[PDB]
Amino acid sequence: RPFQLTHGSIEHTLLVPNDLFFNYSQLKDEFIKTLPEPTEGFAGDDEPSSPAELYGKFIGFISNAQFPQIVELSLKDFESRFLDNNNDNIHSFAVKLLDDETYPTTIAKVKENIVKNYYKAVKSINKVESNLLYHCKHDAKLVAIFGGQGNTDDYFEELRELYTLYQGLIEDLLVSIAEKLNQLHPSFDKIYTQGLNILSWLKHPETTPDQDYLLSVPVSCPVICVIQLCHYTITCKVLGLTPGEFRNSLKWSTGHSQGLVTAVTIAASDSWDSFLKNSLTAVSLLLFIGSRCLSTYPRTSLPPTMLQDSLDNGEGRPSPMLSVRDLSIKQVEKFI
Amino acid sequence: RPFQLTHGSIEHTLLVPNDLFFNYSQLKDEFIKTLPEPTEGFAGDDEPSSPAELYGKFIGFISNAQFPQIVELSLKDFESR
Amino acid sequence: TSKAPGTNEPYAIVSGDYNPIHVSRVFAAYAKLPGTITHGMYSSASIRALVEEWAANNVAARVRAFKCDFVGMVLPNDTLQTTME
Fold it and tell me: Which cysteines are joined by disulfide bonds (chain C)?
């Protein structure tokens, strides 16, 4: 008898080619033993909790196992099963999965198990798609903005999950970046002694220095540019867009306090290698900035009465820069 | 290893042709999911409660499923059995 | 709470104290002591800079005398918690 592909309390059974079930079952046997026990509706973070999520976890699993000619087959199957005429919308497919009732909504289990595994298993994404948010090539106007220094407290985790997710998209570039850093890292020792091996901190979380030294300027200044550049590389590659032609789509762009260097890189980026070279000149620049803006005004200790009071007043931990809201310029200049 | 055709608390395992087990198992997989849970000796009206009864329910099941050349084979098997 | 350094060599080259108890495994073993323990003077200056801000509210000229007793030894990278009374 022919029987069903199954798991847990949720199942997504697909039609394999009739002459593949044998070896197809080997991957399944290896897969079923890699999944934890079902938990009261799959509330466990690592077990899938929607049929599409299960199928995605499986497709990520088979991508590492040495058995090709199934990875892409099951991949196009996943497409036709969920992404027809929108077979480049797995992001939107993901955020739509957040709306299911069979699936208890949590974006974390949607990002991984679906998107991570897709681009982990997908072959060349180079299907030049529709810049159709600009499809009114005559009517819309895109402008890219690049964040500046200090928009968030815990920033390195953005790069953490980004590498966790699109590793196959950034691994080619960020290692070339970190190498160039290590070629310039020791030349500016004595100001960031805990090293600048980003690859270590990503491949090994415990090797990552504390957020404070991470929040240090000679540290945070280049990695923000790194985050922006990997984001740009991703949005160029998911669309399969060369950086220079994606730039052709934009009308103009500029950057904040810090990221403005990324903006001027984009305006000089034509190919991927040109992009890589200009990113190198960027992170080398912002590393100099981080070094010198600290060696010029080194942040020192602060009287604990001060910051204790400031945190009891609900204010922030004191820092060289203060943001005031809800007040016009003409009166803040009157208080200063 | 070769293993056994089975269900529930009663089993009627037959000898398939050696070159059919593959697709024969597909019908079984479709069949096992159409049967309710065993009930204290299969007191439920719709679950079979004798090996011949199980085999008959299976043979009715495969007759609708699009896979001939097994229906009559298993049928003459039921006869000889 | 404080933490011992990783290596005592930076302190040694600055303080001019090249005492091989703190820099070389072989001497630290010759004296049968637990290893390249931190420079006692470094451990002093560490707690001194600690109290200089936690007791004097980071006003440097307020401290006028400081004395301490190296009761125990500290191997590098050790995490040290102090009380202040």
Answer: none
